[PDB]
Design a protein around this ligand. Structure first.
Ligand SMILES: C[C@@H](CCC(=O)NCCS(=O)(=O)O)[C@H]1CC[C@H]2[C@@H]3[C@H](O)C[C@H]4C[C@@H](O)CC[C@]4(C)[C@H]3C[C@H](O)[C@]12C
Ligand SMILES: C[C@@H](CCC(=O)NCCS(=O)(=O)O)[C@H]1CC[C@H]2[C@@H]3[C@H](O)C[C@H]4C[C@@H](O)CC[C@]4(C)[C@H]3C[C@H](O)[C@]12C
Lengths: 200, 200
């Protein structure tokens, strides 16, 4: 179908963009580099891919959606659902995702944009709030028959993700600190889940 | 004294460096810009100020020391010392420090260095571990007559600072999200202190 060829073309451009970002580097790579190796698979006209930044964020679109459904699945595998084991299932999947080299590579690209005057990032984050994983946790907190947990649901979701992610991701990104292996992941999630549920 | 003039000279160069960073911008500013308006108050020779990055991190040296002693004082004002009120005194001072425009401006400079091949940042962080504020909390946790708190002291210190700082600072820095006013600060610290001490 024409629509399928359209989508196949978009995917070729994104893969080319990503490959350049990884080999040549995000800052080194220009739009014309991407048009160049996309060939005539990109005709300058019909695109919403109007820039290097726009393409990066189209790639991020997909990755966010992919991570969301993966975390959601792992979490909804548990039907029984104590808060402790839902936290723990969310935690394990979330932290694993942040301990891949990819998470660091993308992290660096985003950090490097701190002085961008086009505000692609702010627009992206504001237009995609519903696609972030913390929403998954937020939904469970609501379901909890607890005054405190329903009313603070979003902030608790965000608190939990933060305790898991930081400052480890920040250090992976800024000074390329070592990732956590599987065991350390497990340990950190459990450590965090206890403090969160039961306090020190 | 010669030693006092030496120090006065160093301070002039740092103030010039900082002023440029704030008005012209960190990336826009070059070492020669700094030498330029430092005048002959900088003779190229005796300095350890061998670069724009080195100067930035000399400025950061002072700021870190200043924040450390300020938090330490506010914390040691309390002699009575329940864990709750020591956490709360550390929290209020810490979060206030991160909700100043300065914290954001410096944050952006650091983030922008993510692709620096000189690794000034990693060296700086590794050489100044003892000067970070989390050490203050770490010391209290040790003093607590608690097996769990003494053995995890550093990680608990780092956990607490993180729950306070993130992801708010990250968003101030990346997309210039609004700072918390005094009331929101107070609210967040208390919110966080409860979860930390007592769990949800
Ligand atoms: C800026 C970070 C803050 C997280 C967030 O957006 N929380 C919202 C809090 S709030 O209720 O609106 O206050 C997140 C948001 C989007 C994140 C990035 C997108 O997630 C990019 C991905 C790649 C993925 O595997 C997820 C991690 C990551 C490599 C992210 C790193 C980064 O620190 C970002 C920018
Ligand atoms: C990278 C951040 C992580 C904090 C940290 O170093 N924790 C150590 C954890 S661990 O036990 O070694 O694992 C911190 C460390 C030094 C921090 C920067 C220095 O603090 C620069 C200052 C300016 C000050 O007012 C403090 C905040 C800040 C504007 C910082 C922002 C930033 O996110 C940094 C880089």
């Amino acid at each position: 179908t024409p629509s399928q060829k359209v989508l196949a073309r978009q995917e070729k451009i994104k893969a080319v963009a990503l490959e350049l970002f990884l080999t040549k580097g995000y800052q080194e790579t220009s739009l014309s580099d991407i048009i160049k190796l996309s060939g005539g698979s990109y005709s300058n006209i019909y695109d919403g891919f109007k820039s290097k930044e726009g393409l990066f964020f189209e790639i991020l679109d997909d990755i966010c959606k992919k991570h969301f459904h993966l975390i959601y699945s792992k979490t909804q595998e548990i039907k029984n659902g104590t808060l402790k084991e839902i936290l723990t299932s969310f935690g394990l999947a979330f932290i694993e995702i942040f301990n891949q080299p990819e998470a660091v590579a993308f992290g660096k690209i985003i950090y490097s944009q701190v002085y961008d005057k086009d505000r692609h990032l702010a627009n992206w984050i504001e237009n995609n709030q519903q696609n972030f994983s913390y929403n998954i946790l937020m939904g469970f907190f609501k379901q909890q028959n607890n005054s405190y947990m329903k009313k603070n649901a979003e902030k608790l979701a965000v608190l939990f993700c933060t305790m898991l992610k930081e400052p480890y991701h920040h250090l992976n990104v800024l000074i390329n600190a070592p990732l956590k292996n599987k065991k350390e992941q497990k340990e950190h999630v459990e450590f965090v889940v206890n403090v969160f549920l039961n306090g020190i």
